[PDB]
Write a protein that binds this ligand. Structure first.
Ligand code: HEM
Ligand code: HEM
Ligand code: HEM
Ligand code: HEM
Lengths: 305, 306, 306, 305, 306, 306
């Protein structure tokens, strides 16, 4: 039961590729899916010391039914649009996700080239984002981003499908959203105001004390306890991206979890709000422009095709 | 002695190329920025001492110069000359300001670009923005090592920096930019040996082909130029690969520095118009220029005294 | 499955050792910090992904334990036992809390230490603070490679982590700290060969001396201890050099982890009291212990549930 | 049971040392074998943590019987010479193998010095090769080399002796062959011809499609499926080596497997051929000059004597 | 022609600052060391070619100079001038010799310092010893990027090195040291925006405040000094953070090089005494100078010929 | 004006030394290569920008010079002078061309060597090939830090480069190579203190022995040479360890550059023949020279104009 590299850490470079499968493209796609790990090694081995090239392949709900007969992952469905009073989490088309990471962009680009070379005329590109590390693990808002990710055993338990769906053990669910930020508005706030939005100190990344942390802060809304009283956790691999000329300053959100229910709860709290908070204050400076849900199978699953 | 911009600095792993036009009434805002550009570079750059290697080279176009400054002009400064060859065309596109930003990390480039554009917002219109990245062992999108024959040391200084021939602008340089897109499908149809004949060097090892084997229409042959004096005419190239996989964009962002544009223009002419021995540069059969601009990059002192 | 603290992590290039006593009425403030310590570690540590390697191991002393917690105690937890040998003395000094902070850079250690002490200000009194640094090829102030025979992998786990023998505290460990100052003048008076006889290994190459040549009063001989089964009893050492040139302070900060303090104490006894074959450890002729404390380092879960 | 570093990855530097045990040298050898791990740490600790020094010790069939009284590894025998119609895989003497790797040659050299210092007058050197990384993981033929090595769980299953021989669990079998290449002849081929010999693209290391890959290509012949239909796999740690003046351009082949049967099958296919292929085309440019088989015991085994 | 000490070399990750006074009758021992200092630097430094970057700059005080040498004095050499402002005081403290030791690793600094002090034992009394460390992205203890506006290249040479104005000491420089301790409690009481007003630059991005927003009593404003000619007067700063968490010591070790002490002293005067527009430098409201010494750092040749 | 080869560049982690004789009728092929050598260096070297540090220094022997060129000869160029001392002998062995190839990685050296020999195949016979590697902290096979006292900067230029004393060959240098094998058995028989007396420096710390303790027959004493003017005579050494464990080969590949061979020869004479105070260099008691050749390394321009 060998998972894809869904537990691997953040890297300095990433390419996110989202495509839809054109009518009659199913066969070409199936062939690629079985060769994806082989292509990864072909490119990756060239940089074997410190390259850290990996590709995580995700398949959407509608795409799954077109590609495979038999059982479906229990949690796999189209991304649920959230129409909140103020902010909207839109659902956009996407059949296949390629989450490509390395310590260098060239490796990502080479692999992406090989994948798309095989898929040409079978797929239509929906989104392509080239992500880059920004200083000391910062996002476009200038905050350290990824701090509270689970590690080790906790990561395994939060991310990997287990006995609750045994046919797809070793798989995971990925939710992607591309966000664009209003930097003008954001930079109008004082640092202290920004800290109140996020829920952590800007420079030092220290969490605000519970008596000072607003209920509508990002950290407060995305902290979720389950029925057991245990924290519900996701693994985030967000990357900054952008284009200065077009005033694009972005966060590419990607979160892995063993069930989409966890990610969706966090989304709901952010967009719809709670009793104590109208919505996540971060959304006042952030617009989601894409939204897709994918199941990322175990590596074995892709190979045996 | 006049202090040049970082026009002599080597190739880096990351680059941002930014080309803008100055909007109506934007002159004043632009002048203010120009005087702060070196200051902004240090502000961002110092954070990543000593491996950051952040630099920004600022270029000003012909038309823009007259809008910005009174007094003398650089002797060689004019708009990019469009070349309509029998087969291939080197197009001229608008551009008033060039920002050539390099570092060993993209974040540094992006941060500086953000600061520059933040100051210029509402005074300029973006024309082009390219994020360049090192591709393996200094390769381009055609899979060839690219930059090998760049001059170094004293030779670089002599080829790139304006000297006594135009003493008011000593320490300056001329930059020609062209964004090229490549037809990878067609290129990958050729055998490696055929590709080598196009370039003029061995693909894997980057060793120059013997003179008896090197075609007259090879890229290396056409861009090798001797002056009347019999000396080699040389430019300093800082090309970077760039691209977008989804849109099938595989590019070379060409930038070349020289002490006079005449040198770069000769090479362009040989490539696009051809010689007696060669119809045109074979590389153009797989490469399309989509932008073309010429800028003068002043000495650092010049920008500061503003 | 209990999650241990980073007691199995390897040696780093930088370390801060912080030992404090809890002031009267400081218990509450201390408990709050203890529950946030892992959170503070991540807050600072994440900034320097992935080469930072920041970790903090928190230890609690015997007397402090009773002030902080009701319920069961770790089976082996007691105050450091003073050893008054014929010649050398291992002193016991006050210490309630241990912070063993390691990273590949001192800044990370310093930042974390700042955050911890910021929260504890007015609740604790500092007893000791040492900033450790890697010295050449893993050498100590005596000029010998130091840490060679540390257990690794499964052997490390078995030697260091509390298991079924005390199931309520599984995943914990015991840390013994001693700050040593060295008489470099006297030490440098010895020939290299004499120094090798003191340690029990070759100086330059770090190769262990043959059994027929290794003195019974050598450091290696005295600290080699076999258990009832005839297997070696082992500890995990994270010693760091430290010092101040002006004050002629050349130090080894000793810290050793073990699943039971009995192992470390046996080695101490052999060193300070001697055996039938050896009066004492010859290393002590050039080394003075100035502190001595024992701490229990709980599993990470234990700290969090507070 | 603790294996030797048989699963560890490729490094930038390696020393391969093959010796025979002289008459009456048994005792000296046994002493060293029990100290080998100790010597490794003595040298290795000096270059923590980027040194990555390791030594894998192998013992030959004939040597085993001279050294030890009890049971033998089930698969341990002398290297089987293969006399093909055209190419020959020679068997050469070798009692002990020292496979020494680090990120720096000095570390390898220091350890080798210590080992040989202890063995002087008890062993005769047969072969010594100093290997070095060549660009982006290339061999002397200019191809990326090691791409299809198994990793993680697959590596463990392919390499480590398990329950099928429980007394030697955690051990492995190493086959070494020193190859010299005819670079003149090789460089006479076009790149496309070279690709047909190997079975992969030269520059990009992408495997040739199944409809284009020759049956006598290196990749085709070394593929090998077992009765179960699963792939048979070995772990390769080949290093380039050579001397420019003497026109020596070499590949030092070393492959680990849980049973020698796997490696021997690949050898047989290469040298003797199949129904579809006379022999491996790579052998047309490669001459084996040594050939030895060693069993590499678990670390515990070496320590306990 | 004259070979300077490493006074133009950049900031490193690690530093040791050592200040000693020469005891009565210690002159001879000191002279011997001074002639061997470069030799000791190479002895230690060569071991860590090429990334070690070990250097030692040796400075000699005014009073010490007269005790050590007969003949001419550097034109600008005098004791540090104490400044008694209305509110803040720049104290002058004893110091005859300065050793400014830098490397990319502390071990190298410590080894060299050990060798130097080994030779000087019983001839000198230690006054101060500080172990400096890089803090994140070139930050100081106040959390601001520190060193941004240092001159580079030719400008650095012109600002730092003694030239024709004192030809017997060409290639020398003047170093002013001050150890500052910071009141972090008070400082962290300010909002970021208030802190920016104190310094004169943005905290996170290190971008200089616009001239219309920058307070006259900001650090940047007061230390910006124009000469009669209208040119900027510049110094080269190699400040390092240092500190001890337990004792609440958060420090900046200030060291500035200049071709004449007049430049540094002007900046000091503006900071401590104030101008017409500003009572004093606001940074001093959170910073206390605890040492103050002035040294002349001779050309390397000068030390060798001794 | 004349541009030297990379004779001033520092020591690297990897080196290949290649010595060949020119076969009868090979002159033409050799001349062609000589003119392409810099081109080949760039072809390979550019692939590993910027940390590759690939360089090739080409040397031509006395006899070879006369076969290759007409006209004036370098003033100092002659065959290596055999030294038959009472005890030790410095042998002269054949060698027409020297290729001193250095980089931070062996692959780069090997690739370049491959290209050079590929062009020379059937025109030259290999005499010697050594692959050198860095050994710990810049140590040699004797376990001593090696290269410490090399001149740097201006001093290096003055010691190494031919100047006005032979103006036709300004920018050239003279290289003396000797391959030494060491008797490690005998050497390891000495105590460390005895070894230090042989070399003239401390083993571990690389600190030079005081003048009152340093033997007259120590390596450091014999190779310290003053000229008639009282100035120190200096050479630039790029020695590399090499060896083969199986064959008990532990070597130092000696290469020294100087502006005149007279300097190197004086040091050789002192070592092999001795002085009034010393029979010979004690290092030779554990070191055997197995090759000896002298080459002139022309300015880069000289090779190009061919
Ligand atoms: C709009 C773009 C977003 C930005 C700029 C952003 C930024 C941040 C930052 C700065 C933190 C605190 C440091 C950390 O632990 O990573 C954080 C925490 C977190 N974010 Fe986001 N975030 C974004 C969107 C989202 C979304 C859409 C989700 C969930 C679907 C999410 C889930 C989380 C979670 C779970 C945490 C950790 C909370 C905790 O347990 O302390 N984020 N984010
Ligand atoms: C006074 C300061 C000390 C110094 C400078 C020192 C130095 C060394 C050195 C150089 C070694 C050999 C290399 C190695 O395996 O690490 C060593 C080994 C060792 N030291 Fe220490 N040590 C000191 C104090 C202690 C103390 C107090 C203990 C016990 C509580 C201790 C326990 C050990 C052990 C167990 C070994 C490994 C012995 C073996 O199995 O070979 N050391 N020490
Ligand atoms: C004569 C020298 C040899 C050279 C230059 C060589 C080179 C290569 C190359 C370039 C590849 C493709 C990249 C890779 O997967 O590593 C490869 C694959 C392989 N080689 Fe070799 N090889 C040699 C000898 C051998 C020998 C003697 C064996 C074993 C008997 C062997 C077993 C393999 C295997 C198992 C593969 C992987 C094939 C797959 O499953 O896709 N090779 N070799
Ligand atoms: C037998 C092989 C040799 C070895 C192992 C060796 C080793 C050393 C060592 C360890 C040093 C002291 C550190 C240093 O400054 O580099 C040294 C210094 C030196 N060696 Fe050698 N050396 C050898 C042969 C030679 C030869 C043949 C010459 C020149 C004829 C030479 C010239 C020098 C010089 C000039 C110095 C510096 C002396 C000073 O001013 O302090 N060496 N060598």
């Amino acid at each position: 039961p060998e998972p894809q590299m869904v537990l691997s850490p953040l890297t300095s470079a990433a390419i996110f590729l989202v495509v839809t499968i054109d009518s009659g493209g199913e066969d070409t796609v199936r062939d690629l899916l079985s060769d994806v790990a082989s292509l990864e090694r072909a490119v990756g081995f060239r940089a074997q010391p410190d390259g850290r090239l990996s590709c995580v392949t995700g398949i959407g709900s509608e795409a799954w039914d077109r590609l495979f007969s038999g059982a479906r992952p229990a949690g796999l469905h189209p991304f649920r649009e959230l129409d909140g009073p103020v902010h909207r989490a839109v659902a956009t088309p996407g059949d296949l996700l390629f989450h490509i990471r390395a310590s260098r962009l060239d490796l990502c680009f080479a692999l992406a080239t090989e994948i798309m070379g095989r898929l040409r005329g079978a797929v239509t590109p929906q989104d392509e984002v080239h992500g880059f590390k920004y200083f000391d693990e910062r996002d476009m808002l200038g905050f350290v981003d990824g701090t509270e990710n689970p590690t080790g055993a906790a990561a395994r338990r939060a991310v990997l499908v287990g006995a609750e769906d045994p046919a797809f053990a070793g798989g995971s669910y990925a939710v992607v959203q591309k966000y664009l930020h209003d930097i003008d508005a954001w930079e109008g706030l004082s640092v202290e105001a920004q800290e109140r939005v996020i829920g952590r100190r800007k420079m030092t990344d220290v969490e605000l004390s519970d008596d000072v942390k607003p209920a509508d802060s990002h950290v407060a809304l995305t902290s979720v306890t389950g029925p057991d009283g245990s924290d519900l956790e996701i693994l985030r691999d967000n990357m900054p991206f952008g284009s200065v000329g077009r005033e694009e300053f972005g966060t590419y959100f990607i979160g892995y979890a063993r069930t989409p229910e966890v990610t969706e709860t966090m989304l709901e709290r952010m967009f719809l709000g709670t009793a104590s908070a109208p919505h996540d204050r971060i959304l006042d400076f952030s617009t989601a422009v894409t939204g897709s849900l994918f199941f990322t199978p175990a590596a074995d699953f892709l190979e045996d095709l």
